[PDB]
Amino acid sequence: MKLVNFLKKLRNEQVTIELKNGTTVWGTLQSVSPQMNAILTDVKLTLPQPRLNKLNSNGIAMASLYLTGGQQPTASDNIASLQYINIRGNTIRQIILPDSLNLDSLLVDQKQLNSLRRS
Amino acid sequence: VSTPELKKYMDKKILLNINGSRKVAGILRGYDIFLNVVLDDAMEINNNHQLGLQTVIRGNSIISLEALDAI
Amino acid sequence: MSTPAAEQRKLVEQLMHDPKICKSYLVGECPYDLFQGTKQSLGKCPQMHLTKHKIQYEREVKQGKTFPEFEREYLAILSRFVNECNGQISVALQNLKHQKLQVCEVCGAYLSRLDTDRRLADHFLGKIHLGYVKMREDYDRLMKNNR
Amino acid sequence: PVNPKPFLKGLVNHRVGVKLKFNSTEYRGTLVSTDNYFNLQLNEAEEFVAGVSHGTLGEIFIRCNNVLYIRELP
Amino acid sequence: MDKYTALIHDENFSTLTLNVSRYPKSLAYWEKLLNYIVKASAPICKSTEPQLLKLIRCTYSSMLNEFPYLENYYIDFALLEYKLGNVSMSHKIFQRGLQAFNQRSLLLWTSYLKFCNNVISHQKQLFKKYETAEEY
Amino acid sequence: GIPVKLLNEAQGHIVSLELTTGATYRGKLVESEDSMNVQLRDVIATEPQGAVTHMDQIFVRGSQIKFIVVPDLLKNAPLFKKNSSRPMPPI
Amino acid sequence: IQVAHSSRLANLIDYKLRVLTQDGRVYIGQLMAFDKHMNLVLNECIEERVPKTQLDKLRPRGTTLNIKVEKRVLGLTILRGEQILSTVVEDKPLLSKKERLVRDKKEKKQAQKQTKLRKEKEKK
Amino acid sequence: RYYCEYCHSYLTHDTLSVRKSHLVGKNHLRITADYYRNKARDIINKHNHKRRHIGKRGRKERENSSQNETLKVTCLSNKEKRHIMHVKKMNQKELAQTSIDTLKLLYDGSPGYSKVFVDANRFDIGDLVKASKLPQRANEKSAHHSFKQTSRSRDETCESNPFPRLNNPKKLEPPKILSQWSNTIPKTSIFYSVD
Amino acid sequence: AMVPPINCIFNFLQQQTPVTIWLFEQIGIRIKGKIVGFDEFMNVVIDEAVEIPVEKGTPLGKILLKGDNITLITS
RNA sequence: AUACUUACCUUAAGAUAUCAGAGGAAAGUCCUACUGAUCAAACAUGCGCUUCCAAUAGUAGAAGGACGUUAAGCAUUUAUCAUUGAACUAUAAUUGUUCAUUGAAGUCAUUGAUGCAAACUCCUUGGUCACACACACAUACGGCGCGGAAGGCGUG
RNA sequence: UGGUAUGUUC
Ligand SMILES: [Zn+2]
C-alpha cells in the first residue's frame, strides 16, 4: 500500500491542497508523480488571514504569492489566480478531497488484490 | 556512497561554522562519508573556550569548512 | 554500496584469538589486501579481518605483552610472495637479457631509461610497487630483527 | 556494552519515558512495541508538557522523528 | 619556542633592526629588515603567529611614514592585508597611499581599481570610483 | 542528471554560489562532486549581513547550496543537445 | 498565456518559468533542464524579492498596489531542488511549435550524418 | 557508463579515478578547447536577419523622397569582398589581443617592483601561479627550449641598480599610429635629432 | 594515520571517557554522560546521564539519544 | 597511425498499459499478427469553438525592459565597545556631559541607505496582410476575406 | 575478452 497510487487515481477533480506555508491551492488536478508532485491547472492560490486582528500571517508566503505573478492588483486579500501551477511534493501538508467520490471504490489497491488472489 | 575529497585537509587547522552561528576551529583528524569530522584541540571562537581533547561533529550541522593553513 | 546509511552499517557492524582471525592483517598489512585492487590479485582473503582486533592488538602492543609467534606466522606468509616474485624477476632479467629497457625488481616489471623522472615517478607511486615496497622492507626488517 | 536496538528490545513491556524535542513534552508509559525506525507504541501513558501532568492517555503511537530521548524509568 | 621567538632571538634581527634604527633615511636597511621579517614567515596564512603579523604591519607602516612616495610598497602592504583576509584594511591602505600623492598617481589608481572591481559589488559606487579616478 | 553534470563542466571557472545561510561566495571551482560538495579557491566571501572577506579555499557541503551561477558560455555545452547519436558502445 | 493541460515539466523545455523558493524569492528564466530531485537550470533567470520595507503594502486593507521589487541579475544558474517550492509558466518559447519541429528534424539529419562519417572514418 | 560528447567516445564503468584521468587527458583537452573556440566563433559571426515589417509609405512621405535624388551605391566585386573581409576579421582579432602594458615598462627599476609586477611574488596570486604550472611530465619540451628562465626574486633591494641611467635603459618606444592614416603625419619634425 | 569518527566514538565507549554532547540549538540543553553503545545512525545510549540548561540540571539515568539531534560529542 | 611500457577501472536488481472474456502449455503461472472495454502516444482531420496578431487619410501607438539620465530630486534616518585619568552636573558607587590615553574588533558607502513621485531619452518585440472610408443594433450587434500564434473539444 | 590514460620508438 502506497496512498500515492490512491492519489494518482483522482486526475480530474477539484481539490484543495493545503501546503506547509499556510497557502491553499484550489483547483482542477492533473497528474500526480510518485513523489506527490501535484500539477493543478485552473488554480486559485490564497492565504487565509487568521481572523484575530493583531495576528499577522506568514510574511514569506505573502511575498511568495505576490511574486507568482497572479495577484489581482485591486484585490483586498492575498489571492492569486493563475493557470498552471506545479507543486513539489514535500510542500503539501494535507489535501482536501471532494465530497462526492466513493472511497470504497478507489482505495482498492489493484496490485495488493492481484497478489492476494495469486497467492 | 562517495567519500568527500578532504585528503588534502588532513592534519591542518580548520575553521568550520556549526549550524549557522557557532564557529569551531581545530585540527582535522578524520572524516566520514556523511562529512562527520573529528578534530583535536577544538576551540569555539566568539574569550573563546576550548572544547576538549577530541571531538566529533555531525556533518548534518556543518555548512562550510575553510582551512586556516597552507593546504 | 547504494544508500550511505547502508554503507555505514557495514563499517559499524565490522567495528562491533587466531581460529577465526587472520594474523597477517593483524601484524601489519595483509598481503591479500594489498594487491587485491590491481590485476595481480590472487583473490579475496579467506580468513576474516576486523578493525576491532586491530584496536585490541594496538592495545596489546601498547601495554607491551607482545607475542612473537604471531610475527613468525606473518613472516611465513611473506616468504612465499618474496620467493615467488624473486623467481619472477629473475625470469624478467632472463627475458631482458634474451629502444633501451631495464627491469625494476622493486615493482617487478619493465621500465625504460629513456623516460623522464616524472613518468617514472608515476610508475613508482603504484598499488603494485607500494604493496611490494611495504612487503619488502617489512620482510627485511623482520629478518634483521630475527638476526 | 549495550547497543541502541538491543536497548529498545530490552525495554519491551517495561515502563519508559520518551520526551519529544519540541516543548519538553514527555510521555511516560509502558512500551508495547518498537519499529526499525524506532517508532514507539506506548500503553497506559501519561503526558507531561512541563513537570506538570495534564492527563492520562490510552495508547499512543509516537512518530519516529520527534523523540529526543527514551529513558528507562524507576 | 614558536617561530616568533625563534625570529626575535635570531642574531640577524638584532643587526638589521639596529642598522635601521641608526640610519633612518637610507632605505636599503629598511628593505633588508622587512624582507627578512616576511621571509621568516615561511607561509603567510590566517593562522600564522599574531605577534609576528603585528610585527610585519608595524614594519611596513613605519617605512611608509619615512618614505611616503614608494608606490609599490603601498600596493604590497595592501595585498598582504588582502591575503590575510580583511579587505577593509586593504581599502584603507590604498586610500592612505592615494592620499600621500594628493590623489594624483596612475599606479595607485590603476591598482586600486583592479582591486576594487572584485570587492565592491555595487555598481553605482564602483562607477563613481572611476569617475573620481578620472578627474585626477 | 544534467544539472550536476553542468556543475562538473564548470571546473576551473569562476562560479558564484549562495548558501542557505545567506552567504555568497565567488571563486574558482576547483572540485565538485556528485553530491554537489564544492571547493572554491581564491574566494571572495560575503556574509549575510554584508561583510566581505577573502578566503584561500573553502569546502561547502552541497546540501547547503541554494544556487550556483556558472559562466555564461556553458549554455552551448553539448549535454543540452536533444538530438544526438552515439557511436555503438564497445564490449 | 495559456498552457496545455497535459504539459509536464519535460514538455516545458525553453519556456520561461517562474520558480518560487522557500525564502520568498522568485527566479525567472528560460528553462534548460531538470532532474529527479527537481533541480532546474535556468538560462537568463533574474532573481526577485520583496524587501521587508515594501512588504506591508501587501497586507489586506488606492486601487492597485505598487511593490518595488529588489531584483538581481544572474545568468545560467542551477537551482537546488530542495529549495524549490512551486513553478509557474510566464512566457512561451521563442520558436513556434512548427518551427521547433523543423529544427529538430534538421538536427536529427545532421547528427546521423556525422556518426555515419565517424564510423566510416574509423574503418579506414 | 561514461560518454564524452566532446571526444565522442564511450568508456568502461566510470570510477572517479578513471574519469578524472580522462578529463585531464591531452587529446580530450585539445578537443574541448576546439569546441568552445568554435562556439564562441559562432556566437560572434552568426549572420542572420531580423524580420522586416514593411509599412506602406504615405504619399506625404513619398513626395519628399522624389525631390532629393537617387544616391549611388558602392558595391565591391566577389574577389574584392573576399579579400576585404579577410582583412577586417584579421583587424578585429589583433585589436582584441592588443593590451596596453606601458606602466610595467616604466616602473622597471623601482624599489618595490618585484613584489607588485613580477606577478609570481604577489601576495594575492602568488600561490595560484605556483599551482598553475603543470605536472610538466614531458621534460623533453623543457630541454628543447634552451633559454634560461631568469626569475626575479622577491628579496631585491634598491642597492642593486644604484644609477639606472648608466646605459642600462633604452628610450621609450614612439606612439603607434594607424597605418591607413599614415600620410596624415606632419612631414618633417621640428628639431634636428641625430640618430 | 586517520581516525574515522566511528573509531572516535568507539574509543569514547571503550575508555568510558565522560562526554559532553551538544544537542543542536533552540532546544537549549546539553547532555553529560558516558557512552555505552552507539549506532550506525549515531544514536547513542548514555549511562548516568545528566541534562544541563544553557551545571545544576537534572539526572536521567540511562537514556537512548536519537542521533538526529546530536551536534557535537566532545570530551 | 603501429607497437610496447606502466597506472587506473571492468557494473543495483526488475519491468514495458489496465480490467474482463474465449483457447492452449482444482490452484495459481505463462502465452495467444485472439477478442471486448478503458487509458496513453504519434499522425492525419475537423469544428459558425476561445483569445491575440501595430498610424500612413499618418510623424503615431501597444506589450516588456533599462543592470538609463535629470540626481547630491523631495521627506525622514543612521556612523563602535571596554579601561584609566581630569572637570562637571547630582537623590548616587559617581547614573548624566565634555577632553585626552591603552586595548579590542571594523564590507564599501553618507554625493550612501530608506520612503515617495514625476518628466525625459533609448532598446527589443509585432500581418505594420487583403478589401473597404461604409449608418449599425434587443434574441443587442451577419464571428459570411486569406493566413499565423496559442490553447479547448471531437473523429479517423 | 575490454576502456580510458601515459610516455618512448619508427
Ligand atoms: Zn572526453
Helical residues (DSSP H) of I2-62, grouped into ranges:
5-15
What is the length of chain G?
A: 124
- Provide the 10 A C-beta neighbour count for residue H98: 9
Question: What is the Å distance from ligand 1's center to H35 Cα?
Answer: 11
Query: Which residue is associated with the grid cell 583587424?
Result: H91
Q: What is the DSSP letter of F74?
A: G
**CB distance C119 to C99 below 8 Å:** no
Q: How many whole angstroms separate alpha carbon C15 and alpha carbon I12?
A: 13
Q: Which residues, by Cβ under 5 Å, contact ligand 1, an ion?
A: H 4, 7, 28
**CB distance B30 to B37 below 8 Å:** yes
**CB distance A82 to A68 below 8 Å:** yes
F52, F53, F56, F61 alpha-carbon torsion, rounded to 10°: -50
**CB distance D21 to D67 below 8 Å:** yes
Q: How far is CA A100 from the centre of its chain?
A: 17
In terms of residue numbers, what domain contains D10?
A: 1-74
- H or E stretch covering H23: helix H16-23
What is the length of chain F?
A: 91
Resolution in A: 3.2
Domains of chain F (ranges, CATH numbers): 1-91 (2.30.30.100)
Q: How many whole angstroms separate alpha carbon D67 and alpha carbon D24?
A: 10
Q: How many whole angstroms separate alpha carbon E113 and alpha carbon E127?
A: 10
Q: How many whole angstroms separate alpha carbon G77 and alpha carbon G19?
A: 12
Q: How many whole angstroms separate alpha carbon F62 and alpha carbon F42?
A: 19
SS3 assignment, position H97? coil
How far does chain G reach from its first CA to its final CA, in angstroms?
54
Judged by CB atoms within 8 Å, which residues 23-62 of F form the interface with E? 44, 46, 52-56
Q: Which residues make beta-bridge pairs with G70?
A: G49
Tell me the technique behind this structure: cryo-EM
H7 touches strand K (CB under 7 A): yes
Chain breaks in chain B (C to N over 2.5 A) after: 46
Largest distance between two CA atoms of chain D: 37
Answer whether CATH 3.30.9.10 is correct for domain I1-75. Answer: no
What are phi and psi for residue B16, nearest 5 degrees? Answer: -130, 145
Question: What is the Å distance from ligand 1's center to H8 Cα?
Answer: 7
Q: Which residues make beta-bridge pairs with G42?
A: G31, G77
SS3 assignment, position D25? coil
SS3 assignment, position I32? strand
Question: What is the Å distance from ligand 1's center to A39 Cα?
Answer: 39
Judged by CB atoms within 8 Å, which residues 11-70 of C form the interface with I? 11-13, 15, 51, 55
Domains of chain B (ranges, CATH numbers): 1-71 (2.30.30.100)
Q: Where are the domains of chain A?
A: 1-119
- Provide the 10 A C-beta neighbour count for residue I13: 19
Q: How far is CA H104 from CA B27, H109, H110, H121, in A?
A: 43, 10, 10, 15
Q: Which residues make beta-bridge pairs with F54?
A: F44
SS3 assignment, position G8? coil
Q: What is the DSSP letter of H141?
A: H
Q: Which residues make beta-bridge pairs with A92?
A: A19
Instruction: Count CA within 13 A, CB hemisphere, residue B9.
Output: 27
CATH number of residue D62's parent domain? 2.30.30.100
Radius of gyration of chain A (CA): 17
Q: How far is CA H87 from CA D33, H67, H83, in A?
A: 86, 39, 6
List the one residue out of F16, C121, H190 whose CA is nearest residue G74.
Answer: F16
- Provide the 10 A C-beta neighbour count for residue H117: 19
**CB distance C135 to C74 below 8 Å:** no
What are phi and psi for residue G72, nearest 5 degrees? Answer: -115, 150
Judged by CB atoms within 8 Å, which residues 31-60 of I form the interface with C? 38-41
- Is C116's CB within 8 Å of H140's CB? yes
Using a 10 angstrom Cβ sphere, with 0-12 exposed, 13-18 middle and 19 or more buried, the burial of residue D42 is: buried
Q: How many whole angstroms separate alpha carbon G93 and alpha carbon G30?
A: 8
- Is G41's CB within 8 Å of F7's CB? no
Q: How far is CA C129 from the centre of its chain?
A: 10
Helical residues (DSSP H) of H132-176, grouped into ranges:
140-144
Which residue of chain H comes nearest to E106, CA vs CA? H103
